[PDB]
């Protein structure tokens, strides 16, 4: 048999509008961000979507965007279950500097492989950064399943992907067996993650997949849970890979 | 006390103010309902609430008063559970009827009986109803611990402890036990029926308890989850009493 789910990035927020590295920061969704949620509920409503299950990281943006959808659904009784498993790659020092930035100070080729690539590693998050105490101070993250001292500080592509794997094995995938409708609400990079694994993307060529916000992305898997095809966006084409192209030149310097 | 606890009656929805009995159906909050679960999580985060559970019922209302409150308290990550147990009392044939209209036609003192009584079952809700449907065909009753075929048609305040019983019992209890600080978002005569158990209220006691909407209740219970006093309704108790007095007289003839 085969089985289709829906993952999704967050809907916007002031950060992603002002271009700004977020990651563990618990930005609130902006008002373009709430109407790009309610979109996606209004489509799945439209495809008469019923879920079962949804997952969210314990970014309060993640939560959020899936309340909206399901609001749109009237699925608002439906179990969520949010984990940090979920939660956007940590940026570490990056946390809360301009993108485009870090582009002209430097170089296109070294954001990209920030950004992008699957083994390289921010720089760490220090005691002295503008955001660290808000993010280790916040009781979150003094009852999740690992320790506050042992979260990370920073993460690859790769570090997120084994942190969250066990997480999608263990709690998601067994549900999706079952053959429950299951909604992911997350971000950029953790989603980035579980296509990476689910689609068997090389190392390579997971840096050149963009996702933009409030798209919901259309996935089916396998008796063995892996991609019987490439991962799909719903919505107008053009105006996704027009949003895709603009989070692409997030990282770009002015031409 | 040793531990303590937090409950309350959803914020004002449509039918609230439109002044008809809601119970099952699944009315939404409306502008001035989301203030008052709003101002809700504005009181609970100024007493330094820090929740580790939310208890919800499958209706909306209750549901997104809950998400209100987490979001004025930063507390959008905690766990929520939703159950049937917890919804509102099944008014039956007396859905969609206005609590004046009603007074008007049978006296106050009929309406105050159906509304307040504890052993009094309404009459059972019928398919020639026309929010029969709407209740019974929604997809949350297919998946509730009873069959659908099973579920009330109308209950009585004993009824609705009879059910909310087992659902604190199992799942709300032990976790109390445990420490851990819960919310449990509601409704008027659910709450009400759970109030009734805590603080050992008599059969003929529970009937001038009038619970507002959008308003916390905390209770203190000791080791065996018995409250140690009447539950406190935080917040100025004037306005607090002038909100259950506008309750009481819904079903007044003024
Ligand atoms: O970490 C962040 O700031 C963004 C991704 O930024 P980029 O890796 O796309 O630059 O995560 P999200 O907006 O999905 O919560
Ligand atoms: O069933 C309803 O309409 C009310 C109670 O109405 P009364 O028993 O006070 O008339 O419950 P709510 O969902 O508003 O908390
Ligand atoms: N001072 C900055 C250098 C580039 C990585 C983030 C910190």
Same mark, same amino acid.
């Given at each position: 048999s085969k089985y289709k789910l829906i993952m999704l990035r967050h809907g916007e927020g002031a950060w992603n509008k002002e271009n700004r590295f977020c990651?563990?920061?618990?930005?609130? @969704? &902006?008002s373009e961000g709430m109407e790009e949620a309610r979109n996606c509920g209004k489509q799945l409503k439209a495809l008469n979507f019923e879920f079962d299950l949804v997952f969210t990281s314990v970014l309060n943006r993640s939560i959020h965007t899936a309340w @909206?959808? $399901?609001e749109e659904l009237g699925q608002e009784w439906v179990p969520v279950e949010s984990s940090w498993r979920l939660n956007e790659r940590h940026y570490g020092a990056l946390i809360? $500097? &301009?993108?485009?930035?870090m582009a002209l100070n430097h170089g296109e080729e070294q954001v990209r492989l920030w950004r992008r690539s699957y083994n390289v590693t921010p720089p760490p998050i220090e005691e002295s950064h503008p955001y660290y105490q808000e993010i280790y101070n916040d009781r979150r993250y003094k009852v999740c399943d690992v #320790? $506050?001292?042992q979260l990370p500080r920073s993460e690859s592509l790769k570090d997120v992907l084994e942190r969250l794997l066990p997480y999608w094995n263990e709690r998601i995938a067994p549900e999706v067996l079952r053959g429950k409708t299951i909604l992911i609400s997350?971000?950029?990079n953790s989603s980035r993650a579980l296509l990476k694994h689910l689609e068997g993307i090389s190392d390579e060529d997971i840096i050149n997949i963009t996702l933009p916000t409030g798209? #919901?992305?259309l996935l089916e898997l396998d008796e063995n849970l892996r991609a019987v095809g490439p991962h799909?966006? @719903?919505g107008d084409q053009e105006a996704i890979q027009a949003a895709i192209k603009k989070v692409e030149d997030q990282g770009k310097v002015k031409q």
């Amino acid at each position: 048999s085969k089985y289709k789910l829906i993952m999704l990035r967050h809907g916007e927020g002031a950060w992603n509008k002002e271009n700004r590295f977020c990651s563990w920061v618990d930005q609130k @969704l &902006n008002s373009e961000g709430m109407e790009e949620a309610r979109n996606c509920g209004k489509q799945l409503k439209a495809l008469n979507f019923e879920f079962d299950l949804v997952f969210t990281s314990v970014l309060n943006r993640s939560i959020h965007t899936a309340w @909206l959808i $399901l609001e749109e659904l009237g699925q608002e009784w439906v179990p969520v279950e949010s984990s940090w498993r979920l939660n956007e790659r940590h940026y570490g020092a990056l946390i809360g $500097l &301009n993108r485009e930035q870090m582009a002209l100070n430097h170089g296109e080729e070294q954001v990209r492989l920030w950004r992008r690539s699957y083994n390289v590693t921010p720089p760490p998050i220090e005691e002295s950064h503008p955001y660290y105490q808000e993010i280790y101070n916040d009781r979150r993250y003094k009852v999740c399943d690992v #320790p $506050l001292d042992q979260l990370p500080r920073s993460e690859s592509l790769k570090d997120v992907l084994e942190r969250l794997l066990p997480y999608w094995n263990e709690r998601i995938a067994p549900e999706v067996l079952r053959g429950k409708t299951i909604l992911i609400s997350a971000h950029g990079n953790s989603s980035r993650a579980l296509l990476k694994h689910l689609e068997g993307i090389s190392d390579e060529d997971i840096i050149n997949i963009t996702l933009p916000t409030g798209v #919901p992305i259309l996935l089916e898997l396998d008796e063995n849970l892996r991609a019987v095809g490439p991962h799909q966006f @719903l919505g107008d084409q053009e105006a996704i890979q027009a949003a895709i192209k603009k989070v692409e030149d997030q990282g770009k310097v002015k031409q």
